[model samples]
Target: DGTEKWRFKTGKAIEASPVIGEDGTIYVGSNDGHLYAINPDGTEKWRFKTGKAIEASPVIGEDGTIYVGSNDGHLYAINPDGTEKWRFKTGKAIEASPVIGEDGTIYVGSNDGHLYAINPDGTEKWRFKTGKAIEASPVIGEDGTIYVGSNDGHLYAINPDGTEKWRFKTGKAIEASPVIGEDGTIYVGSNDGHLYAINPDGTEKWRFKTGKAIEASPVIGEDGTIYVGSNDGHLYAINPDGTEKWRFKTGKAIEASPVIGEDGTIYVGSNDGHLYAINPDGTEKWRFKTGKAIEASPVIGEDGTIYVGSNDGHLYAINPDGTEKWRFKTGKAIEASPVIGEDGTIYVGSNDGHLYAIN
Candidate 1:
């Protein structure tokens, strides 16, 4: 059943995604200039203040340490109990999410146009500079290569030792995160109206062009097909061979990424204020309407329930068949993606300056 279990209010709005710890504690940052820790029972666990609003999401280290960046130009390391362990200073505001490497190194980009690798103890190991600001998160390959993009219209591949291996060009700017395919092909969305397929060695394999720039990142289905949304108000399915499989049109541009169900149903939210369930064959299966545009992506629950937020300031719980199970209203729109705890508790943030937990 969809219901409002509790809501945690803050001083300002929230756009950062909430992350959960192994012990069930949920952590989220707010524009209020603080990172909040909430207990499973919906009570406040702790609140750590930063110098400015936190638009970046937090990543958990192996030892339960949480690393989050603030617009204040610092990355603060806090223990599970909410006390500060150490803080590392960056050159500028951090809007991208951080990724932890296998050897306990944390990698994050900043508006200062550099990617900084910080040690677990709040020391900077090295920094890799780019041509422009970096707002996209970095993804580490299995072989320890960190791949990230910048507003300068290039994707840089960095070695574990903080050296540049290669750089691939994707015109305009790349705000979308790159995804790795099964064949080691890197699928990256581009603002240049194409989904670029790059080889691991920094060579171009193929390019699938859309009608407009891609706003949502590309997601790969099990069958080697690519699904992505574009500013042209169409969700396109591109084949692995760089050909068009199908195109599903929505009412407006799609800013949200799509989620595929286990049953082969592709679920995605559009700026048209509707959540669409499209068949793999590009046919519309069902649609659930919302009050405002949906820039936030949708996540599937264990029971096939689709959880998504809307600009209308409501988080909806839609069943697999596109029926409304329930919805929780917020004070403002939600740009933060919903995170589901192991115990079926849903966590989401709203522009209303609150984090709502549902069950």
Candidate 2:
């Protein structure tokens, strides 16, 4: 039911998520060591070369500058035109994505077992040491506190001034990013096979166990229900109080995060090559089959178009009813998630080393 719009070839694979700017410029990183800035019509604007493969997603600041980390052990600040503003060196490779704070602070983690807070000008504001390497992205709270997880099996809550607010220990390593609920509840998952809900002070509210490791982050619904996937091939919906609401099983491991629609539908992907749409009541709404596994998370447009990538090297646009609207093939598998521009253009990256823009 979908048609091909355009395709771009890159030098390697793309595991980093794509982000869009206000002017419709698409930004994404590739394993080929380049960060591409693409026009809205699938044309290339510019490309910034990094020192190594970039698995971390790029984040844009309020001024249009791009912040992303690389396996090369550095976090770069690139101007909108693709020129380098500055680069902050870390002790080890950086696979964690960077997050921007309200005051222009850039927060990112490194495999060196440290989380660095850098100012907008690329100066080091402060550094917080962790027990182990950090792979999870940091989430900032409304009160200017930061939340991040570590492979050391703990979630650290840091104040804006780099002071430790609290740390909550889990049973195993934590690679999943933390999500905050509307009421300030911090939700995160761990390799110990549990999803935990923590209070603002870092005390455990409750934990819901699953069958296998949980690396996928959880998303909160408008009604405060938590949706998360597990490597054991299940997507669980837990109530705000840590009780199970329902669980939906997929065909394979689920590394993708769930995204909710305005109509209360949940969209997620499985490694078995299927994108599922589950109803609020835990019933199957529909499932769209792709050519390969889907590790990329789905993003929804205002018109109900769901954009996601498959390991088969294609980016798909699914209609609200689980029908295909369009698909653009890349040169290699796509592990990166798709992002939408304000004008409805879709931006995504592929392992083939190129970033694409589809209208």
Candidate 3:
């Protein structure tokens, strides 16, 4: 809480989320066309240079391999030693994170308008084409169905075999990640400023409208309550029945998703240059200001620490009471969320084209 733990420099900005390895190593992507592994004590383990910038987060497989998509039009499977295991080239840039399926297959969207299924060995098992780019991370349903939104204005459900099960049309591009409820209902936001509740069979349940575009993902609380942020400068909590439970207005547009604590407190960041702690009943708990806009979502550690990035080129760790714990500055903007290791080390990316580790 007193000084910088450690800092690593990069050549470009970073918009990728960090994935914690089982060995306690942290991995993330950078706009500098590289993926890095940082030690638990805030030092570099290894760095894998790629063909282009990577804006997607890394996902770990059961076998301990790291999978990530890159803007270089390729999906990389990196070994724990920071070496390339395998790679699958796509037709366009891949800005979406790869989600692992039940059978250890990799599911990810590409700007080339295709959803691909790659085996653990990095071989293409199958693929399904969409109308446009898939910028949102795909989420797997409890029943093994894969759900994702596309810029073509549609939400899709694909079987594990890469066949389309169903598709739902929206008013505009559906760029937000979908969060599946316990009952299998899917919730996603769109550029048309609407959050939709789609049934398990791809039927519409209902939708809540916002004042501006919603590009952020949705997170469900333990109580089945839904939380999401919008460019409209507001965060909303809605009941399972499509009714508004509460709302909190912020000074700037909120592009980050809210993370709910075990005690029901909500944490989110906004582009208005502030991070907020909101009560479950919609009251402001406290707020922390950074030097610039915050478009990254905040992640909750096991100890209730809040971590997020800001366009001001800083990554921050705030304590439970909204007080600063630690901060590390980077070379560029940071629009990615942080992930904490089992040992309490923090991992995040910055626009400086590097992924950093702080203990």
Candidate 4:
């Protein structure tokens, strides 16, 4: 009893992850078509209703405004006080997360097969059409180039003005977000079972093939190492040149992105119902098993506490050594990841149709 802190209920299942603001407020959406803002102490601050379920994580702007999309085919700009700033309708559901540009603009993709640039005032700045649905989140490079993947089997690079820079075709669909390294190298995975490293000018540096599909976005380490997972049931590490550093086999597919801790330890979830901590050299440090599959990515708190969601309907707080510190049970499975606030409050969404906050 002393270990349990708090838990809240949701009406429908949650697939969208949560995001924390600068002021310690946590934001998340649910399948019930509602977005919630919670205080640092685990109390509900406010809620915003959408027309349909939201399946992507929320992103915060420099002005404290929150941006997210929903299955209702709308993108909303919500103020810090939980009021609607504005909303723009797309042609279909939005599963890709939004990315904030250096200029306070927002860029995101929609299942409608379009990449949109929305101004801070909610007006459309520009739009790029794709051949098919776009399920990958957009990534912005230092030079302002935008990168995203499409179900049409093409990876697109667009200039800031919405003009096409280049398009690289793959053998299958791409559902993972592309990560840009410090040196401007673009890294992404595809359902074609390959992970690609491309130069800034649109030339492929190299490619690595896995046994199955790759839907997990890669995270770059401080030293430029790439970490990602594949449906082949293995997590792989590739060098900057696309050489295989190592691979760790799991009991099931790896669909979630890995989060790197300050000390370079890697944390990610597996459909096998386990959270793994791997060393920089690709050795396993520790593993914690949940009651169900884990598709959510792990978020690291300021002090190194790891928070992740399980399809078993639970949110977990794990210690640095991979020990369970505490767990909160929810109404349904959790596919979205957890977000940690500056003050230590945790936010996540669940399949139970509600967004939850715990301190």
Candidate 5:
């Protein structure tokens, strides 16, 4: 049976995804302006308060320092013990997640219209200004370049030192992250209603249109098939060469990024309140219904359990056969994806101002 393992209440709703430490501490941010560190047993370890609400996901560095941005216009570095290590202020709110480079460099975007690089010690290395706010998270390329999309309708490739390597303009703003193919081809979605495959050298390879603005990121299968969702309520499987392999229709728009299971089954949630399991050939295997719309993406456990959240205020666990394993209700809606602990615990955040741990 699916039941609540334990729930920890915060001062406000939790809108950011939760992360787990190697030592098993659960870290999550809340709109209450605090980052809560909790034990595996659902007890509070410590809490670090920011000046404003925290909706950005927390990234744990190699040395156990947690770095996360906040609406207070600051990116803070918190120690493993939940103490403040350092904080770097930006000109505006930080809505995107931060990624750390191999050398302890942190790259984060802000609505201040710039992407800033910070060192491990909280010192600013450099800032790369974009034409507009960067609402998408940044990804590092094999050559150490950074790939990020902007609300300015362009994807900018920046060198490690914050210099512009290249920029590819799109038809509209991009709120989705870019996915790099196995062969170095860059796949990114835009509000312009296209999924563009760009070469590593900053040239366009091909673009597949879905006729709707796509804010969901693409997921690549082992055989190189690209799976992406759009606001038009469809999941398209595009071949590497920019041809449509197949398309699966949904009842409503899909804002969550699709997840691929080990056996090539595609799992994605729709605003229509259904979790679809698509076969490798674009055929529907099964659909799991939820109480309300879903924006949070789904994650698969090692044992094939799919975990997803819904605006219905429940975190659902679905089996591979499309049957419900369990459902845990929170006080309000859940807008964050669930993270699995090594011990098989499911951690999710709810708009009810709580982080729930379900086993």
Candidate 6:
């Protein structure tokens, strides 16, 4: 396998995704009520305490500011040096990941039934109300419009100024994030067991039904093929035209989003405690077994190395051929995704309240 670089313990379990800053710094939140910043050498740079657990992923702006949300109903803006810039309070908890606009505006959702637009200065620009809570992350369109889903079973399109463009109703709540296709089409899944392809104008282009709810986000292949996992224990490959390409079955539900390698290989994790390497043609390449369910998404390194976490409290690095390159043990479950810094340093957080940096 590969070699172990380093690991850093946080205050609690890590359920949030880690992101790399321009300076090769790793930023992630822990359920222990703190956001940690680690250097490339596995050393602690700084830590910012929040009012509650941090479940949402951190998004770094071009200016080196980190934007993250907390279960304590606040969105925090932290400077690259780990100092607090400002915090915006919401009506309820925030589980949805934050997204930045081309103009430096931040868009995030709250369980309080609203999608908020905040300026880079940490001031609230506007908020659009939804019918229910929102855990799905927002994706921006080529036209500067924002697309996000709500637990109220709706996918909304909001203008750059926070005006409602349109909203399409689904059969159930949506915890999956939206992905924009090459043709400007919006793709998103629903807990209602359907994957919808919506036009830029908010019209439904097509919808493919899955066997069960779809909590995983759809990942687009280099050839425009759509890959997504379902709770029905299947990974589906659908054509851009909404036709089924193929399906790969797993042992249980799939809540982890699929990641694509440079060679067109598909990497995804399942609740069955398996990390699957699927070929673009829908054939099984290989599957790496883990000790517990995998809700964490996989990330690929520069050299085709795959990094993923498991509920079994371990982080794994797999070769392109589905072989184990290395494994790192943690204190608790790893539900957060791994991110690679510019220096090839691997970073992830654990449910045990620690953020790890592996060289």
Per-model TM-score on C-alpha atoms: 0.98, 0.94, 0.93, 0.92, 0.98, 0.95
Clashing pairs in 4: 12-351, 12-352, 12-353, 13-350, 13-351, 13-352, 13-353, 14-350, 14-351
The predicted structure with the larger TM-score, 2 or 5, is 5
Tens digit of lDDT per residue, candidate 5, span 1-359?
46688999998888978999999999999999998999998999999999899977899999999998999999999999888999999988999789988888999989988989999999999999987888978999888899999999999999997899999999899998899987999999999989999999999999999978997789999999999999999999999999999999997889979999988899999999999999999999999999799897899999999999999988899999999988888878899899988878788989988888887
lDDT of 4 by residue, 201-319 (tens): 89999999998899888888888888889999999998888889999989999988888998999988999999999999989999999988998788888878888888888888899
> Candidate 2: misplaced stretches above 4 Å?
1-8
Query: Which regions in candidate 1 have their CA more than 4 angstroms from the true location?
Result: none
**Highest lDDT among the candidates is held by which one?**
5
Clash-forming residue pairs, model 5: none
After superposing candidate 3 on the true structure, give the runs of residues whose Cα lies further than 4 Å from its correct spot. 41-44
**Which 10-residue window of candidate 1 scores lowest in summed lDDT?**
208-217
Error of 4 at 331 (Å): 3.5
Ranking by TM-score: 5, 1, 6, 2, 3, 4
Candidate 4 ranges with C-alpha deviation above 4 Å:
1-10, 41-44
> Any residue pairs clashing in model 6, and if so which?
1-325, 2-325, 10-354, 12-352, 12-353, 13-351, 13-353, 14-350, 14-351
Give per-residue lDDT, candidate 1, residue 332: 93
All models: lDDT? Answer: 0.90, 0.87, 0.84, 0.85, 0.91, 0.87
lDDT of 6 at 221: 85
Report the number of clashing residue pairs per model. Answer: 0, 8, 7, 9, 0, 9
> lDDT at 40 for candidate 6?
78
- lDDT of candidate 1 at residue 48, scale 0 to 100: 98
TM-score of 4: 0.92
Candidate 2 displacement at residue 221 in angstroms? 0.8
Clashing pairs in 2: 10-352, 10-353, 10-354, 12-351, 12-353, 13-351, 14-350, 14-351
